[PDB]
Design a protein around this ligand. Sequence first.
Ligand SMILES: COc1ncc(N2CCOCC2)cc1S(=O)(=O)Nc1ccnc(-c2ccc(CN3CCN(C(C)C)CC3)cc2F)c1
Length: 859
Amino acid sequence: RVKKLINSQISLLIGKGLHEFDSLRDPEVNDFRTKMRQFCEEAAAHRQQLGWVEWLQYSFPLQLEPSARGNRALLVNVKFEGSEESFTFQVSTKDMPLALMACALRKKATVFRQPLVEQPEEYALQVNGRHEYLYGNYPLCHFQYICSCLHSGLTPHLTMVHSSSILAMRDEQSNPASLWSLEQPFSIELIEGRKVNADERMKLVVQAGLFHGNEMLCKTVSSSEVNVCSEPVWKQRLEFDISVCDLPRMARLCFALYAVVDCPIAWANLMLFDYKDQLKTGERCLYMWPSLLNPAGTVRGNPNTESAAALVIYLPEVAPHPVYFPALEKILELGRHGERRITEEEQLQLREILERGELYEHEKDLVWKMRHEVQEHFPEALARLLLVTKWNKHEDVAQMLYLLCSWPELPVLSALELLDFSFPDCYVGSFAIKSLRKLTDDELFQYLLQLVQVLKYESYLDCELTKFLLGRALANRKIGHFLFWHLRSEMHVPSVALRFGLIMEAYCRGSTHHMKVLMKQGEALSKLKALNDFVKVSSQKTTKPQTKEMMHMCMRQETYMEALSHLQSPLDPSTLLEEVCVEQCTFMDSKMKPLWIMYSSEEAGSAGNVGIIFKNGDDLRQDMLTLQMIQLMDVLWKQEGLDLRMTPYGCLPTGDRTGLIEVVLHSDTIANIQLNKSNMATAAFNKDALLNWLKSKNPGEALDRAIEEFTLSCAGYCVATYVLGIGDRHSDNIMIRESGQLFHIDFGHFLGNRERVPFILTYDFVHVIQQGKTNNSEKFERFRGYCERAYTILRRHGLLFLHLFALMRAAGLPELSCSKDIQYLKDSLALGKTEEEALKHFRVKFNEALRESWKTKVN
Ligand SMILES: COc1ncc(N2CCOCC2)cc1S(=O)(=O)Nc1ccnc(-c2ccc(CN3CCN(C(C)C)CC3)cc2F)c1
């Protein structure tokens, strides 16, 4: 009764009926579902018995300041859960939550004239009207919430929540109750093709290659030219220059059907061994993807069989019995035997190339020969060694694996490199995952987007990365929340819909309660899509105030009021979207008419006043990636004591060309501010407009802080947009907060898009930095130091950006497709240079931007 209901809820939530999984009659799919359902149910059972503080860590993970990861007076308002009464008292930013709780309990004991049985140790502090809590031994300023309150001048509002109330939360959210002997050359039979569409004047060719990730295992082989028709017949043997015994475990056979007089038509790939390590034999009908060879492409066929071109091949029965890939112990027994001492002049050449990339043929022979010295004295150079390993020789792969199986754990930075498609071996991926287990939940969340993209490179459904991601998502509700949405937003992509659908179902088995919370979000998103469609049509016939009044009426319907109210925000599960403020809702006049949905919450006070933007028609993945990169910059800067007052607002794709963007309230575009309308708080010179607007928002002594906020954030965005190559910057996509913080929006073009984006300096912004003065080198040169400091901090982490962007090539974003896009980051970060050379080059670029800025000052 309940299992049937849950299955129907999973189907609606993931956007694909579970019956469709069953209908594939696919053993691999069935074994994934069984194994992962069991793995996720164990996680759920472990969670239901967690202690009350451990359950707060699961459900409300701490939001700490980046500097606090791994003195001053403060007013705080504290209430108790079943109370309207509140106590405002002064604490120190260095006090711990326990002291604040003990203080609140003394105030409650004297007001209620009774000495209390409850100890401060029995409570946690909830941020009012948010799924956010303050707990643990950390000073108040170490929490992101208190730190945020400190800068914005607002008073923290906290609610004392008792352990029994937290346990009541935990309880109501419960789940219900031998190859190496086969020396023959590898070969296949190209039988025939189906549903082929091509120019009848041309001829058809099938090119085939053997790959181990990016590297070709042997030379490619082509079929003979056969006349173009819908059902081509070849019925010919294709033989490769590699012995069957040497095919590595992760070998893939890649096809490309094209037309010749070049006209690409289709591609299809497959793993030579199955998920149970057995070499494949018999016929295979390969349903091809429309387009020369595509090795990174998926190894599962095109699901649109009704119209996909197919390629029938035959994998020969190389043995009278099934052949399985050797078990690890047999590989290790073979690799155990090898040879290790060569010249100090050869040793010195190894230290130069390992601390240097690309290298010559003789240097590969030197790195391979000294592989034991690589393991012992340069363990972090494992990736260079794996690249020199000849993956087409089964005995060199066995020696690489013997060293790998005793390789010391590498740092997270090194592991993120190893997840790249250039390291397709399963043991290498397993080693990379083992070195990633030490990632904190905060580091994991920072890199989650890249780890999800790595799933598209996985050759098999059940893998160490999926289990690692599912285990982390079930142990942290915020990780779980975003893993769900990163997968859900790609269900319209046929190449990932099965893998992603299966991960989402398995996660759902682990948290029935969270599945229901996510349904409530999908219901709101469903209604927002209908509302945006209504707005796009109505905006073409009537005026903006009429379409807005019609939008409000459609929102005031009972179905909309229920669907859109009392939900956790997809942008941030800590943010509660309570009462939709229909009157404050609106839409932008851009082509897709994005909706601006406003919310309030009595419980949360001013912090419950939040906005979300529903956007349908544009792809939001590039915006999300850019905004995550700016947030990563902000974390790296704050880790060095540098706060550039950045505004990395939320952006989350949720569906096909659909997603949400977090509203930053009290913000306006530079264009609106520069409109210089009359009867407002009105410049003599348009250059005075931003500064006058800052003055009206920050009177008296507050102007100085607003100018400083502007300066810091301007330096941060100047460096961020330059490093990332964000172009097409104009007054309509640069915003300013009433606090003075400048920020950028609308990141549809990055990494040059394809020119080399120069460093930018705007006169109107220089004018604010210079406090409205023509000459103010004191304030201007403080700003130049903020820029150089920010830039030099990012260069020190250049490899982190490079590794993350390399993992993102799997996303298929058009402006991040090849090594040419990664080159842009190398050039902007000047990674081939020393710090002095790169600082000299940054100074030349900043000075160039100043002379260009002066072409406006001169006018
Ligand atoms: C990529 O899209 C976005 N990215 C970030 C934001 N961000 C918007 C700000 O928060 C961060 C995200 C918003 C959008 S969008 O989808 O709304 N598209 C664009 C495009 C150009 N310009 C804008 C704009 C134009 C004018 C204004 C000025 N505000 C004044 C205050 N009202 C309220 C009182 C209703 C709204 C208009 C803002 C714009 F964004 C909005």
